[PDB]
Amino acid sequence: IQSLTARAPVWLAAQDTLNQLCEQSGETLASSNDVTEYMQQLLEREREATVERDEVAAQKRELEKQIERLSQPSGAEDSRMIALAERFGGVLLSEIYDDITIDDAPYFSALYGPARHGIVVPDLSLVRPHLETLEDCPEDLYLIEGDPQSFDDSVFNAEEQTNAVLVKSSDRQWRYSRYPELPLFGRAARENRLEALNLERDALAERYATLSFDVQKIQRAHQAFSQFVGKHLSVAFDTDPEAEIRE
Amino acid sequence: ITIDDAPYFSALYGPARHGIVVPDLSLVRPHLETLEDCPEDLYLIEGDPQSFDDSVFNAEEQTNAVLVKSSDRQWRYSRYPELPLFGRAARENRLEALNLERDALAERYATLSFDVQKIQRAHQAFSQFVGKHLSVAFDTDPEAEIRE
Amino acid sequence: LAYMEGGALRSMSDKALGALRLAVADNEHLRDALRLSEDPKRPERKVQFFIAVYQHLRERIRQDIIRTDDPVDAIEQMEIELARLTEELTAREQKLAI
Numbered sequence A: 001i002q003s004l005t006a007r008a009p010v011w012l013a014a015q016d017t018l019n020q021l022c023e024q025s026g027e028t029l030a031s032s033n034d035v036t037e038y039m040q041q042l043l044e045r046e047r048e049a050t051v052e053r054d055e056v057a058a059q060k061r062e063l064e065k066q067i068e069r070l071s072q073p074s075g076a077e078d079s080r081m082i083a084l085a086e087r088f089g090g091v092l093l094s095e096i097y098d099d100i101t102i103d104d105a106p107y108f109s110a111l112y113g114p115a116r117h118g119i120v121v122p123d124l125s126l127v128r129p130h131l132e133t134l135e136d137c138p139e140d141l142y143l144i145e146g147d148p149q150s151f152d153d154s155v156f157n158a159e160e161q162t163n164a165v166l167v168k169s170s171d172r173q174w175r176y177s178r179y180p181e182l183p184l185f186g187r188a189a190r191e192n193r194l195e196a197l198n199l200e201r202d203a204l205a206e207r208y209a210t211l212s213f214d215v216q217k218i219q220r221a222h223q224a225f226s227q228f229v230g231k232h233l234s235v236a237f238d239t240d241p242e243a244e245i246r247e
Numbered sequence B: 001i002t003i004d005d006a007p008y009f010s011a012l013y014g015p016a017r018h019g020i021v022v023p024d025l026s027l028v029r030p031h032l033e034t035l036e037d038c039p040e041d042l043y044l045i046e047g048d049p050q051s052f053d054d055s056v057f058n059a060e061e062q063t064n065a066v067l068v069k070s071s072d073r074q075w076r077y078s079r080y081p082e083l084p085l086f087g088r089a090a091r092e093n094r095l096e097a098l099n100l101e102r103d104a105l106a107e108r109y110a111t112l113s114f115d116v117q118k119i120q121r122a123h124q125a126f127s128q129f130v131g132k133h134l135s136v137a138f139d140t141d142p143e144a145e146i147r148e
Numbered sequence C: 001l002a003y004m005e006g007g008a009l010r011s012m013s014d015k016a017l018g019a020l021r022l023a024v025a026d027n028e029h030l031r032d033a034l035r036l037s038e039d040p041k042r043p044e045r046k047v048q049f050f051i052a053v054y055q056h057l058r059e060r061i062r063q064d065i066i067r068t069d070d071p072v073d074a075i076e077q078m079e080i081e082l083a084r085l086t087e088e089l090t091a092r093e094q095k096l097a098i
Helices: A002-024 A032-069 A078-086 A104-115 A189-235 A241-246 B006-017 B028-032 B089-132 B142-147 C006-023 C029-037 C043-059 C071-097
Strands: A140-144 A158-161 A164-170 A173-178 B041-045 B059-062 B065-071 B074-079
Touching (some): A002 A241, A104 B006, A164 B065, A173 B028, A189 C071, B006 B065, C006 C029
Antiparallel strands (some): A140 B074, A164 A173, A173 B041, B059 B065
């Protein structure tokens, strides 16, 4: 009786800890081997959830990068377009066409092509010296000549076609710009579209948070099981003393 | 095309780097309205595919860059890219380097998997011991008590 | 604890009450219930205090975004909320900067 009594409290605390740990799970444990397979299932769920979480995070990061790219000063290639714009007494072409209608925006964007984002500089000789210096700039920088405040439409070999525009960029060379959707020009409702991107990313962030919480919960369950087994295995699944002591 | 001038050719061509050498230009205009899946800024040039004459540019070479009079009141500045569209030569050594990195990752994964296998085996041995010899584990020798 | 003498139980209870003193400093109703609970001739008050804890812990659940009636199971939901609010804080900081 005294030996069983001495053994008792350890066994009782072990039983209570094990019952709490198992009930926290949907399963009830019955063996050390069974605990090992539960650990294996925990590892499987963890290695899965982490992959989904990372995939969602990559999608998320792409979404915020896209949202930022449309931010300032007027959503464009502002990484270097900024310095390229204020360093010279010019104005962004996209900003110049900032207020164009959503309907004329695709037409003008197709008409202007890769030069939509160009910078208006009436001289073209201010950039002539600095050209050699420019090593950190978009692989294709675009500049146009005219009055930034009242620039006259760039003369083009344009040829409008159904929802598109052909153009002769140089002798024997044509660029065919199909009417884009949600264009560069007309950057007033494009702010509304980056708001729509924020709305879209809201659900992505919600799902990422759920996945991260699941990962944390699985990690904490695994750590609790580890601590358990550290303190617990010696008496796990052993016979009940209380009944023996009463008998 | 040579690796040396390939970045130069890419910088000179710009977005027109990706283009089709159609010496007629007559199959496009009727089909132009018929092109919908084509890239939005489709680029087409007139030249002989057998001997494509050098494309027309008013090109000035700056240090690792170029300036081209793309059109009236339009001067375009470009820099030299890497892995240019021209002179690909299949760039097979880049594929090989990527394969080397992937194979190194696979080898590392194999080694880690083997280590995990060994650790699992040791765990199962420990579990087996504690399942069958835990009760008498570390306890004293009964032979002395028996002799006493 | 069924196999531990009363003196050690008194000692653990004393230590726990000392901790509760600091823990419940802010609250007034829980503090008053605790201040009542130490009379040794009214044991049920102690039990009541526990109820008063859980009860209180339930009303302040802010069930608008939480559901678990048991506060012990709401720690996960608060952790979820902290993670979500950290994300929202990052977004807000970026927006303010721009």
